């Protein structure tokens, strides 16, 4: 009776699948798979991505920022909503390739550091490439490239660095406010009563309140289904998206469920 | 056509075939798996483990400990042969539940830190979980616990920071040299002209110098099968095992004619 | 004109002043300085530091740890208050010396990682050698060692990462509820509107109120003028001790009038 | 008697002097101080700073940047001859503020990563901010930025990772061979029986051997007194240069004489 063998962590084939880059505002395009957001914000003075995706989507990211007219040197940074392997995977390989930097607040740079490893809930179930960020942020902390500012918001429960960002683009000269928020969604987690997570509760309610008072006119997620999103439609992939309100209470009427069937 | 999935590293079942800790010395023991190498010193003033395999055998580890009467607290010092997936496995997690500490020279540390990623002949295809190392170890620079001084020997190859410890220890009185050398190998390295190892053939053949003149009256390696080591058998286990001049002999008469074929 | 030559980080005598170790309840020791607390904590398993002072004091510490009946190879785990080279000083040394742990959360284990370089509020002021942290813990976390537990509490204020710990020991059979809570002052911070620290006022209105609902029968501090501890006399010492609500109510005096007079 | 205080590192007023960009090759500039070599070099893609001097020194390389009309988001790269206080001092500051990468080898990375503390002679004694290394290079390993291949040398000796660099620039067409080979010196240094340094002198000695071979027609060293530099002058700099067997020859016969008195 030898041991178990290595599990790999395999995923959806619609999150591996990729597509061309669809356009979100003037600046902002979505470069990643289909259920999988990968942002790209070009500028004048460099390019911005928030998220990259599985880490095997290294090289679908390369291709969609050269159809952009984006060289692996102009990307200057690299923003992520939470450091797990299924958004954060290919940031190890993406700075040995492009020279750019990673910013992410103390949580999110620990858990970076150790490539999702030792997760307070997963353990080492979804281990990715470790990667090491540059530069720490703090809540509220304005990050400005290319005269495009990026606001942190600390929106603490999936990860205790989830982070939701929001920038104002353009949609021919009218201005847009997009709010990238992340996931408030906890599969499998024991809400009450967890050692490595005490303030678990208190974090999701803290975090739902947050999500609300975003200053958003287009609402976007790590995983496009859980605000609405259709990445695949094209044109009409922002048609049935949420609101920070309706995506805020959608995901805490869950979470009271979860939590209220979690006692029983 | 989506991206491919990730793929485990998946090895042999016997190298994950959990084995009873066989005596090596009065100090030495072997509590690891059948074909992989994993030493326990056991000295008055704490333990001493040397490898620890694949990732999944920690908890195999940690029971064979206290069968030597080891606490998790005892053991108060890691050392490797070389960070890969297969011996710098259960690192991470042994630092978490023991409270020891690793020791290793600036190549193996710089490996161990990024869990084997970006490995210079597979890349990413080994990751294990990161640990990082509390001591920095020069060649030939003496590690002491207890009584028991461990001097290590660099012999770069398989890996930029493959390291072989030479200790003495008794067998009734009478002391034995033991000298753990690492594996001088090369599966699949591309050997002449690696631009991420330029001077790979230097260091190999400059290793099997190194092995040759190593102290050594009982040889053990990370694999058994490469020291004609028998875990299995228990008592005969030492019987057929090869000498220093016969490991570095045979592991040369491999590498050039795997280097002849090459340039074919 | 040259360019200025680096200024060393002087402080006041009394800082690097030792003393004999002072015995604050049954298991809990001060073993710092005259103005610089260093509490060591005695259990059947082990021992534990809480916090370590100038990086200078590596020595003075292991002194009295070895006149408590503690070696270096028994000290299991250091604590820290928050990462400033007045307190978390010879963490890198004591390390290297007694093959001891340490646990902090994200925040503090990011500042140690760089030795107090690129503060918030100081820059390149308070280097200190860089240590690296083993266990990341989280709000209310509890850390068992003997025993004894140690019940995190974050105070964020001072640093992004701040602490306080709680833990109850004995007099004599009686117990005793000790609280050791970090420093709750801001010396030329620029309080309101500062881009590195944008959520400052909030984290420390938050902190005063965490330290007035602390379990605690006697307060200590990182300073013991600030907790009106007296080191000196000895067994007068907690005499004049503050309480948990004298302690934040003051701190937070000085804090309103700090920033009225930075509006002006 | 309380205990001493820390004490800054404090150098000679000349190394601190700044100097305007002084023109070595068509591509290579020197902007540092007049005793402390800094190497710029520009290219079509980007640009590779080589050392940085003192920590203090940052503002000093940025001044010097602009005036060669190089952006702080141009310098691409940063090299390092060995990771000590007085060459890889502003690293961690120029990677904040230029968004620019550093490769270096292991043990400059080990070294880098603790900011100089725990230095194998020096000790905590000459601490600076710390800095990561984004890139691990090998002996031998060729880094191209814009056209210029810079291969790496390894010279071990006043460091474990020194490293020296050669790069093929031009003068008005015709190409000139540039070699930046590291400090060759050992003050104070114990040579023979080192615990720390075990093989100090076969390094030593090896590495006077690797510098005569170095393919140059133009020497430069980290100080360039070293290597008969005269930064003040101007034209007249590279007048009574040294070759690489004048260099390794002086400063082995140095070495030797230096070994000869520890003996006595
Ligand atoms: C780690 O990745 C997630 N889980 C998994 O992939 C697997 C699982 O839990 O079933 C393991 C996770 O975070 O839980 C991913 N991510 C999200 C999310 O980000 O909301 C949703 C929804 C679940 O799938
Ligand atoms: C990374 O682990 C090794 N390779 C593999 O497991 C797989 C492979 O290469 O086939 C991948 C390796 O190091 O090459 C292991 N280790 C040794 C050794 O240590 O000698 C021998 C022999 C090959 O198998
Ligand atoms: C960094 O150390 C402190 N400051 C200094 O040592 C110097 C200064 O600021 O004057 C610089 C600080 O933290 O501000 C120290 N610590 C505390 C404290 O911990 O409360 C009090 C009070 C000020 O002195
Ligand atoms: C650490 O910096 C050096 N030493 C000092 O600055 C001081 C000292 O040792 O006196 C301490 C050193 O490396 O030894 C510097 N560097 C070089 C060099 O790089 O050759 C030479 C010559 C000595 O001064
Ligand atoms: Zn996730
Ligand atoms: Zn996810
Ligand atoms: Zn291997
Ligand atoms: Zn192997
Ligand atoms: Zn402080
Ligand atoms: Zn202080
Ligand atoms: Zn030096
Ligand atoms: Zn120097």
Redesign the interface.
């Given at each position: 009776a030898?041991?178990?063998?290595?599990?790999?962590?395999?995923?959806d084939?619609?999150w591996?699948?990729?597509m061309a880059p669809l356009q979100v505002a003037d600046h902002t395009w979505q470069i990643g798979?289909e259920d999988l957001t990968a942002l790209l914000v070009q500028t004048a003075?460099?390019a911005v991505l928030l998220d990259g995706g599985?880490?095997?989507?290294a090289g679908?990211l390369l291709d969609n920022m050269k159809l952009r007219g984006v060289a692996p040197?102009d990307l200057?940074?690299i923003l992520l909503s939470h450091a797990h392997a299924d958004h954060a995977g290919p940031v190890?390989?993406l700075?040995?390739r492009t020279?750019?930097?990673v910013a992410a607040?103390?949580?999110t740079?620990?858990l970076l550091?150790?490539?999702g490893?030792?997760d307070?809930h997963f353990g080492?179930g979804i281990?990715?490439?470790?990667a090491?960020a540059?530069?720490?942020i703090?809540?509220?902390?304005?990050v400005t490239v290319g005269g495009i500012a990026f606001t942190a918001h600390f929106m603490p429960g999936h990860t205790?660095?989830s982070t939701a960002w929001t920038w104002t683009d353009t949609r021919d000269g009218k201005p847009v406010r997009i709010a990238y928020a992340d996931s408030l969604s906890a599969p499998g987690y024991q809400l009450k009563g967890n050692?490595?997570?005490?303030?678990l509760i208190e974090d999701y309610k803290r975090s739902f309140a947050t999500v609300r008072a975003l200053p958003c006119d287009l609402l976007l997620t790590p995983h496009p289904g859980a605000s609405n999103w259709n990445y695949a439609v094209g044109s009409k992939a922002s048609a049935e998206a949420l609101t920070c309100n309706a995506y805020a209470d959608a995901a805490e009427k869950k979470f009271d469920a979860q939590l209220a069937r979690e006692t029983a």
């Open positions: 030898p041991l178990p063998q290595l599990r790999a962590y395999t995923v084939a619609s591996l699948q990729p798979t003075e460099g599985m880490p095997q989507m679908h040197q200057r940074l190890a390989e700075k040995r020279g750019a930097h607040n103390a949580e740079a620990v550091a150790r490539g490893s030792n307070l080492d281990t990715y490439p470790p090491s540059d530069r720490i703090m809540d509220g902390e304005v205790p660095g050692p490595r997570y005490p303030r």
